[PDB]
Amino acid sequence: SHMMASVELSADVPISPQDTWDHVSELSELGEWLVIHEGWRSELPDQLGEGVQIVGVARAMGMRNRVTWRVTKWDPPHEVAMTGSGKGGTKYGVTLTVRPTKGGSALGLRLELGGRALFGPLGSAAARAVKGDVEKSLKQFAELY
């Protein structure tokens, strides 16, 4: 359906695990350090949880878009995972993880950018080589049950 570029990095910060988690959970400050986030368009939910939607602004690779972020994972005080969709089929993913380590915490940020807006219709054509596997597997499943 679409193509994706994913980069996950980790940095050891001299910050306590609960402090790092309280910081990554304060979405009202997310735009002040996360580069691709430029602000929110909806009031931030009272309690952030799995299934919650928020509308925000994203700037990726010279492009700006209104993105409907959907919280896909909420495991405090360890991980928050968010999936977003934008105009023109732009797809986004952000996964923030917090681990306790010697000296402080390990903050892991995984960012996934894709869609036809970012890879073009010809670059996104590389994904049609997996359609065979997917369709054959679904056909076999239907024939199985």
Place this chain on the structure above:
Amino acid sequence: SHMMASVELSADVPISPQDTWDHVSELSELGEWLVIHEGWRSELPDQLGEGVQIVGVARAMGMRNRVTWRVTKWDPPHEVAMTGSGKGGTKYGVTLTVRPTKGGSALGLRLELGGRALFGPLGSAAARAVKGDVEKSLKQFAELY
């Protein structure tokens, strides 16, 4: 880090959504329909959940690899999502969703394949344009707090 292709397709099954879910969630029979899954090397636990790790074999794009799958999401009876790391760079993702539809249910399979072994050294270089933003976000977090 790595470059991903993602294909999500759907198939109708003339049975109840609970039946379809009980059939997909039995990942012991995944080899009977999922083409890229050629069996397990680990034995599956008594019951599945988030964080479960199991080793299996995967053949994709003409390459046979040993994959260490991890269950990233378990939402019965709707969705199960697992990610596989492999070696040689090959990244895998399997998402199985079950929905109700006319005449019964629909199984949705999202297959994600990537890594340097699948996209080459030159094709994998499209993600370093994102690694810069990831690095800048981590540095700005470490500097802000």
